[PDB]
């Protein structure tokens, strides 16, 4: 497919986010590249408005599943690449247990040779004393699966999963994710059978960076179908 062919090599990525959480406004710019052949993402995000008012790990899922490695035998299930280059809209509600929620709308598409993720995020009903606005999450990340179901009616897909965020006191904070993806173009896309993306994420810091930022190394592999 034309879409799939766009990902056979290393592709530059740009991520741009404008956020408002409980009235705390912030912006983030990210740059990196993706190599779908290996399901590999390398990305560095910088808060351009100063200090990020929420923990970096809470924004990982929001900050390009078109870079997932779909094994050859599963290639017909890759909705994300099939929608390229025109791209897709990705919307989520992320509900933090006993705390507030993020709602996100993003457009993921090519601008020239570069894969762009443009995001608007709104967070409401958070506790200033809570794990999120209080910055009580550990700077790490567990492996998680993303469960995908087709949405024939919208010519797209949906997904659900929960993220387990480790808390500094030894507990875990759950973040329930509802996700929907719909093509921007009106052309054909691949509608998958049920499957999941296995995702491992590693968070780090750039030793030469003084700004508030996050370095992300991530591997994403489609699975669940034999």
């Amino acid at each position: 497919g034309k879409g799939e062919e766009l990902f056979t090599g290393v592709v530059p990525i740009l991520v741009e986010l404008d956020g408002d959480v409980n009235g705390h406004k912030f912006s983030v710019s990210g740059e990196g590249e993706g190599d779908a052949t290996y399901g590999k993402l390398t990305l560095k995000f910088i808060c351009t408005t100063g200090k990020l008012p929420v923990p970096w790990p809470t924004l990982v899922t929001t900050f390009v599943q078109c870079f997932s490695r779909y094994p050859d035998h599963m290639k017909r299930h890759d909705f994300f690449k099939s929608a390229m280059p025109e791209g897709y809209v990705q919307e989520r509600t992320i509900s933090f247990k006993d705390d507030g929620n993020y709602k996100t709308r993003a457009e993921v598409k090519f601008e020239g040779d570069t894969l762009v993720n443009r995001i608007e995020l709104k967070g409401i009903d958070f506790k200033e004393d809570g794990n999120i606005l209080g910055h009580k999450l550990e700077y790490n990340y567990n492996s998680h699966n993303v469960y995908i179901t087709a949405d024939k009616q919208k010519n797209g897909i949906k997904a659900n999963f929960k993220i387990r965020h480790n808390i500094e006191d030894g507990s875990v904070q759950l973040a329930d994710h509802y996700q929907q993806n719909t093509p921007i173009g009106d052309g054909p896309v691949l509608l998958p059978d049920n499957h999941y993306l296995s995702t491992q994420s590693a968070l780090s810091k750039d030793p030469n960076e003084k700004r508030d930022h996050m370095v992300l190394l991530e591997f994403v592999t489609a699975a669940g179908i034999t």
Partner: nanobody
Amino acid sequence: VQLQESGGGSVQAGGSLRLSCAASGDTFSSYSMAWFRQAPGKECELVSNILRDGTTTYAGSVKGRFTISRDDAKNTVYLQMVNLKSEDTARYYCAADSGTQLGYVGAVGLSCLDYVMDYWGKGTQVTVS
């Protein structure tokens, strides 16, 4: 909430079994309920859902043989299995969740817990001979 499965055990191929799962407490109807199963050395499978809105889904391999249902008075969910096959041998788990549930069925990973649910039963063995 505690979940307790019953109604499993040994059964002849071609036979039937009705699994039951009873929830404690007074908060059942708002939960989406699911049955998972895992055989030795295989990925866990979410075999059937019954969502809060009543919607049911089934893994392709059990469609037409398995029927999921719930009783919001007895706070129980059931899995009626007919024409059991050797392929159905596994430990079966009941689960309840109040988060996003869309009716996913199929493989979920090497641990049933990889598909995050609010509450889990300890499961019950079903062995088809």
